[PDB]
């Protein structure tokens, strides 16, 4: 990987972020993108500011310049797609910060684990192309074959891990270079385990395992910590519905357009197209958001909050409020 030139760096540094509190649950990344003509610069800045503010790269020997380089190396690896672009991962990062620090989830983990989660947010969908794992396996693409012959159906996640390891293997972008022995090993391993757990095919099993561990007073402690990390990155990944309605709506539009584009390609190549990806059906956004809420996100947040993450109660409340708003849209249709 080519090095991060100083103007690249300096450009991110000049962003000022006035009128924004990045630690707030109502922080609005869409507004931040619109507030200047270099949104990719402002996004980077939000991440940088989040990490320095936590107090954590400092404690694990990661300097500010390495921190920036890492972010910028991650950024160059994000494509221009509607949803799975760099803003999604910065959003996941900032959202995770709120879970740890407004939701008190920090109490369940070590400082290193908190540091790892914030970093892992930025790598977790590196080089995403707007196409889901299913696409690669249907069209027998190289990545699909490679994953399949390697023994792992989590096509993109193994890909994102491979690239995260490749970025951290360069010392000018190694945010974990100041760690040693068991700590270094733990950061790599937990980072990887977290990104592999974002595959939604494993959603049910990762949720059941966390729940089972949280209910058991004699759970292996190390194991509980890992699963809590995995669940928190999962939580950030499906956190669009826990945000203020207008934000949530904006995310929904973006993911919908990405899904549609995949469907367009699937038609071209002749493979099977599901209705959710079919632009020639035009379901309403509301129904699609209500279904995601009822089948995936409300039970997930409700369950983890009740199991042991009591501080995240606002996620359940906002999901409830967002659902009602979507119902209201349909009720006055």
Ligand X SMILES: COc1ccc(C2=NN(C3CCN(c4nc(N)nc5sccc45)CC3)C(=O)[C@@H]3CC=CC[C@H]23)cc1OC
- Which residues are documented as binding site for AMP? 84-88, 125, 237, 289
Give the C-alpha separation, 84 to 29, whole Å. 14
- Does 307 contact ligand X by CB under 6 A? no
- Cα angle, residue 310 at apex, residues 198 and 328 outer, rounded to 5°: 75
DSSP 50: H
What is the DSSP annotation of 278-300? -TTT---HHHHHHHHIIIIIHHH
In DSSP notation, 242-265 reads: GS-HHHHHHHHHHHHHHHHHHHHH
> How does 72-107 read in b/e, with b if 16+ C-beta sit within 10 Å?
bbbbbbbeebbbbbbbbbbbbbbbbbbbbeebebbe
The site map against Mg ion for 170-209 (x = CB under 5 A) is ----------------------------x-----------
Q: Residue 106 or 210: which CB sits closer to ligand X?
A: 210
Q: Which is nearer to ligand X, 175 or 323 (CB)?
A: 323
- Find the shortest distance in angstroms from Cβ 274 to ligand X: 9
Q: Kindly tell me which of 66 and 164 has the beta carbon lying closer to ligand X.
A: 164
Out of Zn ion, Mg ion, ligand X, none, what residue 296 binds, judged by CB under 5 to 8 A for its kind, is ligand X
Counting contacts by CB under 6 A, is residue 200 touching ligand X?
yes
We find the least distance from the C-beta atom of residue 85 to Zn ion, in angstroms, to be 10
Chain breaks in the chain (C to N over 2.5 A) after: none
Q: By CB under 6 A, name the one of 237, 242, 258, 305 that touches ligand X.
A: 237
SS3 at position 78:
coil
Segment 223 to 242, residues that bind Zn ion, using CB under 5 A: 237
Question: Token pair for residue 224?
Answer: 């509980």
Given 84, 97, 159, 225, which residue is catalytic? 84
Residue 91, interface with Zn ion (CB under 5 A)?
A: no
39 binds ligand X (CB under 6 A): no
Told to check if 147 binds Mg ion by CB under 5 A, we report: no
Q: What angle do CA 112, 114, 120 make, to 5 degrees?
A: 100
Catalytic residues: 84
Site residues for ligand X per CB under 6 A: 200, 237-238, 240, 251-252, 255, 288, 291-292, 295-296
């Amino acid at each position: 990987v080519t090095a991060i030139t100083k103007v690249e760096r300096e450009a991110v540094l000049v962003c000022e972020l006035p009128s924004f509190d990045v630690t707030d649950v109502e922080f609005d990344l869409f507004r931040a993108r619109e507030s200047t003509d270099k949104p990719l610069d402002v996004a980077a800045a939000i991440a940088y500011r989040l990490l320095l503010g936590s107090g954590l790269p400092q404690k694990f020997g990661c300097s500010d310049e390495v921190l920036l380089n890492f972010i910028l190396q991650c950024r160059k690896k994000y494509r221009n797609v509607p949803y799975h672009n760099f803003y999604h991962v910065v959003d996941v990062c900032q959202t995770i910060h709120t879970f740890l620090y407004r939701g008190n989830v920090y109490e369940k983990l070590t400082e290193l684990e908190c540091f790892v989660l914030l970093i892992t947010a930025l790598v977790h969908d590196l080089d995403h192309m707007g196409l889901n794992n299913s696409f690669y396996l249907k069209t027998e693409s190289p990545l699909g074959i490679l994953s399949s012959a390697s023994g792992n159906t989590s096509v993109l996640e193994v890909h994102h891990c491979n690239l995260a390891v490749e970025i951290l293997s360069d010392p000018e972008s190694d945010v974990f270079d100041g760690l040693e022995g068991a700590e270094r090993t733990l950061a790599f391993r937990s980072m990887i385990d977290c990104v592999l757990a974002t595959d939604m095919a494993k959603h049910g099993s990762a949720l059941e395992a966390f729940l089972a561990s949280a209910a058991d007073q004699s759970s292996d402690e190390a194991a509980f910590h890992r699963m809590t990390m995995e669940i928190i990155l999962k939580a950030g990944d499906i956190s669009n519905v826990t945000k203020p309605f207008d934000i949530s709506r904006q995310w929904a539009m973006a993911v919908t357009e990405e899904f549609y584009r995949q469907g367009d390609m699937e038609k071209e190549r002749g493979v099977e197209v599901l209705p959710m990806f079919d632009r020639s059906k035009n379901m309403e956004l509301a129904k699609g958001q209500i279904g995601f809420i009822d089948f995936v996100a409300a039970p997930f947040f409700q369950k983890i909050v009740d199991a042991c993450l009591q501080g995240m109660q606002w996620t359940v409340d906002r999901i409830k409020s967002n659902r009602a708003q979507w119902e209201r849209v349909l009720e006055t249709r």
